[PDB]
Amino acid sequence: RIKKISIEGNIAAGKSTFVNILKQLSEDWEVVPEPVARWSNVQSNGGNVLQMMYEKPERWSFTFQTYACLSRIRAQLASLNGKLKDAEKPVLFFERSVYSDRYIFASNLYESESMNETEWTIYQDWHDWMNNQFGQSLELDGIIYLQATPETCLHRIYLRGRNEEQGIPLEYLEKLHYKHESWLLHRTLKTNFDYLQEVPILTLDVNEDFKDKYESLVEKVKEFLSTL
Amino acid sequence: RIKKISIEGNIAAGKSTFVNILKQLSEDWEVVPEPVARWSNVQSNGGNVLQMMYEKPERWSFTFQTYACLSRIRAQLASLNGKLKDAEKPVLFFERSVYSDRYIFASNLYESESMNETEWTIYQDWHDWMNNQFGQSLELDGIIYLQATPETCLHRIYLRGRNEEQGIPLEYLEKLHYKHESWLLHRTLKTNFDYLQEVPILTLDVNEDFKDKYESLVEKVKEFLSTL
Ligand SMILES: Nc1ncnc2c1ncn2[C@@H]1O[C@H](COP(=O)(O)OP(=O)(O)O)[C@@H](O)[C@H]1O
Ligand SMILES: Nc1ncnc2c1ncn2[C@@H]1O[C@H](COP(=O)(O)OP(=O)(O)O)[C@@H](O)[C@H]1O
Ligand SMILES: Nc1ncnc2c1ncn2[C@@H]1C[C@@H](O)[C@H](CO)O1
Ligand SMILES: Nc1ncnc2c1ncn2[C@@H]1C[C@@H](O)[C@H](CO)O1
Ligand SMILES: [Mg+2]
Ligand SMILES: [Mg+2]
Numbered sequence: 001r002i003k004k005i006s007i008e009g010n011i012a013a014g015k016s017t018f019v020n021i022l023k024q025l026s027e028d029w030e031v032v033p034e035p036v037a038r039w040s041n042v043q044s045n046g047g048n049v050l051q052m053m054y055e056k057p058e059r060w061s062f063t064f065q066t067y068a069c070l071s072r073i074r075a076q077l078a079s080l081n082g083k084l085k086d087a088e089k090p091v092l093f094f095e096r097s098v099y100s101d102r103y104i105f106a107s108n109l110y111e112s113e114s115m116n117e118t119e120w121t122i123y124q125d126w127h128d129w130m131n132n133q134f135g136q137s138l139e140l141d142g143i144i145y146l147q148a149t150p151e152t153c154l155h156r157i158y159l160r161g162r163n164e165e166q167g168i169p170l171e172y173l174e175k176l177h178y179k180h181e182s183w184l185l186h187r188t189l190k191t192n193f194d195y196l197q198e199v200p201i202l203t204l205d206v207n208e209d210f211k212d213k214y215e216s217l218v219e220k221v222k223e224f225l226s227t228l
Numbered sequence: 229r230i231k232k233i234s235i236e237g238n239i240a241a242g243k244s245t246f247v248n249i250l251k252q253l254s255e256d257w258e259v260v261p262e263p264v265a266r267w268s269n270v271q272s273n274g275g276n277v278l279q280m281m282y283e284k285p286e287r288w289s290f291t292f293q294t295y296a297c298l299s300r301i302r303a304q305l306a307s308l309n310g311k312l313k314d315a316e317k318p319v320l321f322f323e324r325s326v327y328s329d330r331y332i333f334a335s336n337l338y339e340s341e342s343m344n345e346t347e348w349t350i351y352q353d354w355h356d357w358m359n360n361q362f363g364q365s366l367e368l369d370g371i372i373y374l375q376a377t378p379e380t381c382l383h384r385i386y387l388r389g390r391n392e393e394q395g396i397p398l399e400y401l402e403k404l405h406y407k408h409e410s411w412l413l414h415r416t417l418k419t420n421f422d423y424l425q426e427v428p429i430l431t432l433d434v435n436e437d438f439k440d441k442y443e444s445l446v447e448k449v450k451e452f453l454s455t456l
Contacts, residue, residue, distance in 0.1 A: 047345055047349065118291075125298075
C-alpha cells in the first residue's frame with residue numbers, strides 16, 4: 001500500500017536538504033523529518049539533551065538514544081494517518097530509521113565505551129521490544145543512501161551551524177561513515193531484522209554541490225521508486 | 229472480564245509474601261510478580277542495575293526507571309494470555325504498577341535530585357506514551373495497599389537480605405511511605421490518569437506477624453473482590 005523509504009546518511013551529508021525536494025515532485029509523496037529540534041530543548045526552557053550527549057557522551061548517550069529513537073518512532077507512526085490514506089501512489093520518506101539509531105549511532109557509542117554493557121543490554125532489549133510491537137507498521141520498502149565523505153560532512157556541519165555539533169571531530173564522523181558503508185554499500189552488517197538484508201538500496205553520491213546534482217538525483221529516485 | 233488488582237506497598241512491606249498466598253485461594257486467581265531478580269543481572273554475568281542505582285542514584289536512577297517500568301509492563305502484558313482466558317471468575321494481581329513506578333519511585337528520585345529536569349521530562353514523556361498505547365489493557369479495577377511503618381519495612385529489608393537493599397536508609401523508606409499514604413490513604417495525590425481517583429482501594433495493616441494476620445486479611449480480600 002504505502003511504500004516506506006528511509007533516507008540514511010552521515011551527519012550533514014545533506015538529508016534535510018534532499019528531503020525538502022521530495023514533496024515538490026509528487027502530491028502523493030510525504031516526509032517525516034528527524035526531530036533534531038526537539039532534542040535541543042526537551043519538552044513533554046528545557047534540557048538540551050543533544051548538547052549533553054556531545055559534552056559528556058559517557059554520561060548522556062543512553063538517555064539520548066532512548067529519547068531520540070522514541071521521538072523518531074512517534075513521528076513516523078504519526079505519519080501513517082495523513083493525506084496519504086487517500087493518495088493514489090503514496091510514498092512516505094523517513095529521515096533515518098530505527099535501524100540507524102541502533103546499528104549506526106547506539107552501536108558506535110557502545111563500541112566507544114560511551115555506553116557500558118548494562119546500558120547497551122537495556123537499550124537493545126528496549127529496541128527489540130519497541131520494534132516487536134510497531135513492527136510490520138514501520139518496515140521499509142527501500143533505502144536511499146546519501147553518501148558523502150566524512151570530510152565533506154565535517155565541512156557541512158560548519159555550513160549548517162548548529163552550535164551543539166560544532167565540536168564534532170572528524171574521527172567521530174569517520175566511524176559513522178564506515179558503519180554506513182558496511183550496512184548500505186558492502187551490505188556486510190548483520191541485524192536482528194532479516195528482511196533488511198533483502199531491502200533494495202539506492203546509493204547517491206552527494207559530495208558535489210546540490211544545485212548541479214539536483215536533476216540526476218531526481219531521475220534516479222523516480223526510477224528507483226518505480227522498481228518497488 | 230478479567231479484574232485487575234495491583235498490590236502496592238513500601239519496600240519489604242510484604243508483597244511477595246502476600247502474593248504467595250493468592251493462588252492458593254482460587255484457581256481463577258493469577259499473579260504477576262515484580263521482576264526484581266531481573267534487575268540484579270540485566271539480560272536481553274550482567275549489570276546489576278539495582279545495585280548501580282542504589283550506589284550512585286544521581287547517575288543510574290533514570291536508566292533504572294526506564295528498565296524497571298518496561299520490564300513490569302511486559303510481565304503484565306504477558307499475563308493477559310494465560311489460563312485466565314478460560315477461567316470463570318478471573319482475577320489478575322499485579323505486584324505494584326506503572327503508577328507506583330512513576331508517582332512513587334521516579335517522583336521521589338526526581339524530588340531528591342537523583343534525576344534532573346531533562347531526565348524527568350524524558351521519563352514522563354516516555355511513561356505517558358507507553359501508557360497511551362497499553363492503556364485500557366492494564367487499567368486497574370482495584371488496589372490493595374499493604375500498609376507498614378517505614379521502621380517495620382527497614383527491619384524487613386534486613387530479614388529478607390537482598391545485598392543491594394542492605395544500605396537503604398530509613399529516610400528513603402519514610403519518603404516512600406508518605407507518598408503511599410498520600411496516594412492510597414488520604415487520596416490527595418493527583419495523577420495524569422483520572423480513573424485512578426475513582427478506583428476502589430483496600431488498605432491492609434501488615435505491621436503484625438503474617439502468620440497471625442493471615443486469615444483476617446484473606447477475609448478482607450475475598451470481601452473486597454466480591455464488591456467489584
Ligand atoms: N550537496 C550539497 N551541496 C552544498 N551544500 C549541501 C549539500 N547538501 C547539504 N548541504 C548543506 O550542508 C549543510 C548540512 O545539510 P543538511 O541538509 O542539514 O544535512 P543533514 O540533514 O544530512 O544533517 C546545510 O548547510 C546544507 O545547506
Ligand atoms: N507480616 C509479616 N510478618 C513477618 N514477616 C513478614 C511479613 N511480611 C513480610 N515478611 C518478611 O519480610 C521480608 C520482606 O518481605 P517481602 O514479602 O519480600 O516484601 P516485599 O515483597 O513487599 O518487598 C521477607 O523476609 C518476608 O519473610
Ligand atoms: N540515535 C542517535 N544517536 C546519536 N546521534 C543521532 C542519533 N540520531 C541522529 N543523531 C544525530 C544528532 C545530530 O547531530 C544529528 C542531526 O540530524 O543527528
Ligand atoms: N520503579 C522503581 N524505582 C526504584 N525502585 C523500585 C522501583 N520499582 C521497585 N523498586 C524497588 C527496587 C527494590 O528495592 C524493591 C524490590 O521489590 O523495589
Ligand atoms: Mg537533517
Ligand atoms: Mg516483592
